Each structure stands twice: as C-alpha cells, then as structure tokens.
Amino acid sequence: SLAPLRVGILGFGGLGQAAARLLAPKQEMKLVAVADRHGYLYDADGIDVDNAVQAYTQQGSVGKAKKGQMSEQSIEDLIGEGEVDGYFLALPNLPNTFMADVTRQFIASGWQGVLVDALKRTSAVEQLITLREDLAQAGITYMTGCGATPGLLTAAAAIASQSFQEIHQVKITFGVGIANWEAYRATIREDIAHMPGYNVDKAQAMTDAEVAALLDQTNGILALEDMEHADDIMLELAGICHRDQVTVGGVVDTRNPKKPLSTHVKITGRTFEGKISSHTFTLGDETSMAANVCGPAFGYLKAGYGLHRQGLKGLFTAADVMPKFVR
Amino acid sequence: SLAPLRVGILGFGGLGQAAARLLAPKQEMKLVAVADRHGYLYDADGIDVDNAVQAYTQQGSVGKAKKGQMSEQSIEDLIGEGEVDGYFLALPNLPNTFMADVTRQFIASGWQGVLVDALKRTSAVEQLITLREDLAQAGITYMTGCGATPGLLTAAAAIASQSFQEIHQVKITFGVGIANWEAYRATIREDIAHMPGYNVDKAQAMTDAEVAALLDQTNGILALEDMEHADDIMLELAGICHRDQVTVGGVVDTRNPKKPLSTHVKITGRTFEGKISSHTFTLGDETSMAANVCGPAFGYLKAGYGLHRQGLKGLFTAADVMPKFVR
C-alpha cells in the first residue's frame, strides 16, 4: 500500500466498468489505465471511475473523459503511456482472434508484466496455448480463464479433486440474472453465439432488434446445455481429468437481477477405497456475475504478479495457481 | 512415471496405513519408506503394504516386516537410509511438540526435500511458523495443515473468498463416521483433548477403558463446537480474514462408518456491490476422513515438490498454494 499494484482494464463494456468499481475501494491495487475501442484514459494517481463511466456511456469512449485521449489504436498507445504492472482483458474476444491479437500486441510491444483474461471458450484458450512460449520469451505472465467459469469454479474443482483416486465428472451449472440484456451486451451476444441455432458471426451480425426478438420467445431466458467451455482443457492441463469429463451448462435470465438458479460445480470421482462420490461447491445467489468474474480475475492478477516477480513467465490457468486475495 | 516421486510416511496408525493404501495404485508416486515409534521399513522398489500392515498390527511395528529394522530412533535412521523426495507426517503431535521435534530432526539431519503434515491445531502450526527460516535455511519445503481441515476445506475457502471485497466469516462443520474408535485411536484421543472437560495431557493419560466410558455416555458421538483449528491462522496468513472470523466444529460418530452429517465450509462476505452472501463447499458423504486427509496431503506433497524444484523453500500452508493432482 506504499507500493500498490498498478493495473489497467482493456474493454469498458459492462464487465470492464464493473471491474473498475470493484477496484475503487482497494488499498493494494490501483486502477491507472482503461482502454476502449476508440480511446484510452491514463492517470497514475488513480482513475476517476465516475468520470470514466460518464465519458463512456454518454460520449461513447473513455477517451472523452477529463484526461482521456481518443485513438483508433488505444491499446498500442496506452501500453507505452506509463507504468502498469498488469492488465485485465475485459474485452470480448471479437473477432474471435482479438484476445490473441491483443496478446500479440503485448508480445510485440516490449512490455512485460501480468495479463489476465476471463475467456470462456475452449478454442480461444487454445489460441493462447499456441503462444505460451512467445509469452514466456516476452517476459509476460499470462493468466487465462480467470473469471467465474472458467476461473473460480475451475479452481474449486481442482481443489475438490484431491479427495479422489480418479475423477469421473466435473459438472458446472451456472445461473445469471441481469436486469436487462444491454447491460452486458457482449456477454449476451457471446452466449447466443454458442446457442445451437447460431454461431459467432451470426451472433455479431444480429441487430439489437433481432436479439430482443429471440429473447421474447422465452421471456428473456437462455437455457444453455453442454456449451463449449475452456474449463475442460484447463482441468486436462492440470492433470485432473480429460476434457470430455467436463460439462458446462446454465441459465441466463435477461429480465431479472435475481439469479435464476444457484451456480455450482459438482465433482464426481472414485476414492482409494473404491467409493464413488461427489463434492459440490455452490455460489451465493447474491454474488453477481460481475463479482464472480472480476474478483477472481484480480486475485489471479495478484497471484500472477507473485509468479512474475519470482521469474515465472508463460501461460497459467486458474486450475494451476492459488489466486491471492486482493485488499 | 519413469521417475515417480519417492515418498515416505511417518506414523503408522490408522491414518498412516490409509495413506499407504492410497498410494498403492499411483503411477507417479512410490511409497519407499515407513517409520513407526519402534521401527522402520525402506524399500526402493516400493513398500509391500500388506506386509507392512500385517507386521505392524500383528507384531507391533513395521520394523518386523520382511525387510524391516527395529530401532528406537527410527526417524533419524530412516532419513539417512535412502532416497526420499518427501515425507508425509502422519504422526499425532504427541507430545504436543513432537512434530516440531521431528521437524528439527529433519532440519538437523542434512536432508532436503518436501515435508507435509495434516496438523489440526492452531498452536502446533505456530510452533512450525517459528521454524520457517530454519526450514528455508535447511532447503526444506514444508507444507503444513494439508489434510481435510485444515487443508482441503481451507483451500476451498481461499478460493471462495475471491468473490468478495471483505470476508465476514468462514465456518467449517465437519462430519466423521468410523466403525469403532480404535481404528483411529490417536485422532480420537486428539479430539477428546480439545473437548471442554479435558486437555491434551489428560487425554493421553486416559486408558482405553476410560475412553470407551466417555463415549458410552453419548452412543459414541462427539459434538465439538468452536474447536481450536489452524484453519484460522492459515487464512490470516493468506490475507483473507482475521483468525477470529474462522470457526470450526463438527460431529464424530465412533460407532458408525456412515458420516453423521455432510462436511462443509461456508464462506460469508460482502461483494463490491455491498451485497452480503455466502458460498458453500460440501464434501460427499462417501469420501472418508482418510480420503479427505491423505488425498490432499499428497497433492500438497506434489505441489511442494514443484516449489522445492524451483528453489522455493520455507513454510507453506494449504491456503497459499494449489495442490497438484497425483496420478
């Protein structure tokens, strides 16, 4: 707290804005940097979040905030702009290479430190796997899948697995309750993308009108079974089970701030005594999606910093490392 | 598995014997060494567990097994006897300095590698805290409190805490079901010790007769509220909450292999949005005490080895590091 961690956020939709608010009260982490598609804001003394949020929602970019800069390469520019020990990539992976793309800009930039994401999709994480040496070579400690699921729930499964000689299944069921879908438009467009009638390009092609139409069919409720979800490969890399034994589904209600069911992960395996059994980790209904994503993200940023500081670079997943509570 | 981890177990009561059986099927960990109070057994090709267990139960020490050696300093002797990358200290902490004592023998011995315990009591862990530099100086990576609670459940609370700006309570409630109390006589004597009518010396002073008498009062059922439990200091050192916000109680039924209630930890805190809420991690009724203690212990041994290998020595708790699934 004489030397708080200095962090940035890239992407300033609803999730990135939540991340900024989560950081405000912290003593040992300081938000110094935000970027969005058309602009960036840096302030070594701490970002003024109200000002950034107003600028963004009202004028379309944080580049329009008090000390903001407009730019069509905000990321490139922000990197060079000053001292940041790590960034949270709050960005939707759009186009579906954009995280890796942004990651390559970081690789390319000559910057070193900690990066963290909250990617959801097995295939986006694979794109990051391909870069793991390039990361390590660049001096970057990259923490992937460090949100709710993957992330928190993936780490819980990794811990839970220690009671068992062999794991038979890891089943995640998540609930999301948001007041209206626009509040997390990207997140909702990303869910729709991995819905059986659709895909990523068609999802992004859709208008807000057509989105609202789809949601009307079911009173704003999306029931997603066996989705693509990087929990699977993360638990495989950690040596716990094969990806096929990991299933992820959930319900998102876009017309209610109450969570439509309790988010949980169930871990089933066989003990050395040949008993078959299950542990369950359940999240409280009043922990929002934003809290269960961004809290772990910064706990992993702090952990990643610990690893970076002792010279460990490369790609780490939530299943590999103990996140560290941020105060 | 060309180079499996070579491990030892110290203490061969019911828990240490369970540990040996848990290790049998493993491919990447090999039990090479056991010690008990009056004797030891080493075998670089893998201990014959049936033989060791027979020797112990029937002839009173593993020193009486096929390739066993009797000795009144079995630990001292076993250390020097051959290649072991880490040990699980399955020992009851008796006298209440014995773990530290044994730890000092390891410090003193010139041996380096990984040690792990499953201590329960805040004050035994403090004794190990006092030695953390001596450990690091000796080249030892010591993992403490790496059982069920503390251990598994402590790690789960650490993970769960990431959703919250501030933690209000961590409440652990454990269940234990054993067929008869003698099967884990030390564990049961240790519980009785931290029962309100009693203490450690009186517990150890008691006869098997007087023990059975006490248990008759309640049909073999011990109801333990707000016990001394190192979960508290472990979560404090990890920066998550103050020890006073950690409470541990439970029920042990000494007359039934069925668990009398489902073991769980509840983690209550406030999110950045000022919501108060709780996560719950629950263990399956068919995961026994032995599985929930020894599985995590070796997952921490493996993790500790990872840390040791990259030159990190000293004292680590279950709350600090991600255990690694042992295959």
- Residue at token pair 């076993």: B78
Residue B36 is given by DSSP the state: E
Residue A212 is given by DSSP the state: H
From the list A18, A281, A325, the residue facing B281 with the nearest CB is A281
Structure tokens at B307: 């840390």
| Strand arrangement of the beta sheet that strand B314-317 belongs to | B68-70, B39-42, B29-36, B5-10, B86-89, B114-117, B141-144, B314-317
For residue A208, the tally of other CB atoms under 10 A from its CB is 11
* Residues B256 and B285: beta-carbon distance below 8 Å: no
**With a CB-CB cutoff of 8 Å, which residues 147-186 of chain A face chain B?**
152, 155-156, 158-165
Give backbone dihedrals phi and psi of A129, rounded to 5 degrees, phi first: -55, -45
Residue B1 is given by DSSP the state: -
HSE-up (13 A, CA, CB side) for residue A198: 20
The alpha carbon of residue B222 and the mean position of all alpha carbons in its chain are separated, in whole angstroms, by: 20
Rounded Cα–Cα distance for residues A13 and A187 (Å): 9
Domains parsed from chain A with CATH numbers: 5-147+290-317 (3.40.50.720), 152-287 (no CATH)
Residue type, B90: A
Q: For this experimental structure, what is the resolution in angstroms?
A: 2.0
Query: Would the CB atoms of A323 and B160 count as touching at under 8 Å?
Result: no
* Residues B240 and B158: beta-carbon distance below 8 Å: yes
B327 near A CB under 8 A? yes
Closest CA to B313 of B140, B88, B106: B140
**With a CB-CB cutoff of 8 Å, which residues 39-98 of chain B face chain A?**
none
- Quick check: is A308 catalytic? no
* Residues B94 and B67: beta-carbon distance below 8 Å: no
Q: After which residues is chain A broken (C to N over 2.5 A)?
A: none
Q: For residue B99, give how far its alpha carbon lies from the nearest alpha carbon of chain A (Å).
A: 24
* Residues B119 and B125: beta-carbon distance below 8 Å: yes
Question: Which residues from A are below 8 Å from B320, CB to CB?
Answer: 322
Respond yes or no on whether the N-terminal peptide bond of residue A150 is cis (omega within 30° of 0).
yes
- The CA dihedral of A255, A258, A261, A264, to the nearest 10 degrees, is 120
Query: Would the CB atoms of A325 and B161 count as touching at under 8 Å?
Result: yes
Structure tokens at A27: 């003593």
Rounded Cα–Cα distance for residues A276 and A289 (Å): 32
* Residues A224 and A216: beta-carbon distance below 8 Å: no
Q: Any known ligand binding at B56?
A: yes
Experimental method: X-ray
Rounded Cα–Cα distance for residues B107 and A192 (Å): 59
Question: Which residues from A are below 8 Å from B327, CB to CB?
Answer: 239
The alpha carbon of residue B50 and the mean position of all alpha carbons in its chain are separated, in whole angstroms, by: 22
**How many CB pairs below 8 Å do chains A and B form together?**
167
Give the H or E element holding residue B289.
Answer: helix B289-309
Give the H or E element holding residue A107.
Answer: helix A98-109
Query: Would the CB atoms of B288 and A271 count as touching at under 8 Å?
Result: yes
Interface residue of A162, A272, A286 to substitute, partner B, most B CBs within 10 Å = A162
Rounded Cα–Cα distance for residues A138 and A110 (Å): 7
Dihedral sign from CA coordinates of B153, B133, B73, B34: positive
Rounded Cα–Cα distance for residues A264 and B97 (Å): 41
DSSP B173-186: EEEEE-SSGGGGHH
Question: Which residues from B are below 8 Å from A277, CB to CB?
Answer: 284-287
Residue type, A32: V
Compute the radius of gyration of chain B from its Cα atoms. 19
Interface residue of B21, B325, B326, B327 to substitute, partner A, most A CBs within 10 Å = B325
* Residues B254 and B289: beta-carbon distance below 8 Å: no
- Residue at token pair 């996140």: A323
